[PDB]
């Protein structure tokens, strides 16, 4: 009777309290892995003139732009003319002359938002 809220290609939505798009539930959307909400609304509830909120904002879970090691640079420095670190990147480092990677040479930006393996050094 309420529709259909929407779905998002970015997440999922669930619906709670009548697992339909009746009157009274709620639409709650959830991100998946890759991905977070955005806002602090999540939800669309269903009332007697349709869906009340809209579909709320999930953005691509971006893990924070790595500077470099002391002694190396980023490999993974260009992919994109935008290049944000969204989930599934790989952000590689290299030593420069002389210098070797003291962890490991690869880093990818995990759902958490932070970055899955530790600033790696090189000396």
């Known amino acids: 009777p309420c529709g259909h809220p929407g779905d998002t290609p970015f997440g999922t939505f669930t619906l709670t309290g009548g697992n ?23 939800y669309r509830e269903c009332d007697t003139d349709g869906w009340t909120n809209d579909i709320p904002i999930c953005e691509v879970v971006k893990c924070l732009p790595v500077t470099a ?15 944000e670190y969204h989930f599934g990147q790989a952000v590689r480092f290299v030593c420069n002359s002389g210098y070797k990677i003291e962890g490991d ?8 938002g932070f970055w899955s393996k530790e600033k790696p050094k090189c000396v």
């Open 69 to 83: 090691p002391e002694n190396g640079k980023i490999v993974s420095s260009a992919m994109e003319p935008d290049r």
């Open 105 to 112: 040479e690869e880093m990818h930006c995990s759902d958490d």
């Open 20 to 42: 339909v798009f009746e009157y009274g539930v709620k639409a709650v959307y959830t991100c998946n892995e890759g991905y977070q909400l955005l806002g602090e609304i999540n």
